[PDB]
């Protein structure tokens, strides 16, 4: 869903709210990939 919004963003970006929204989306996607990779590293999971 977040990547669908990211590709739904416009092609030319110059406004400050547009840049802020783009950067927030990019950081969200990066952190989502980090969590998915951490979970997908191995099969069995123990938590504290």
């Amino acid at each position: 869903e977040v990547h669908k919004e990211f590709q739904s963003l416009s092609v030319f970006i110059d406004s400050i709210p547009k840049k802020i929204r783009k950067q927030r989306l990019e950081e969200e996607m990066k952190q989502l990939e980090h969590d998915i990779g951490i979970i997908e590293k191995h099969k069995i999971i123990y938590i504290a």
């Binding site: 951490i38 979970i39 590293k41 191995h42 069995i44 999971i45 123990y46 938590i47 504290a48």
Partner: peptide, 6 residues
């Protein structure tokens, strides 16, 4: 080979 999560 074991994942640990806080």
């Amino acid at each position: 080979q074991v994942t640990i999560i806080p």
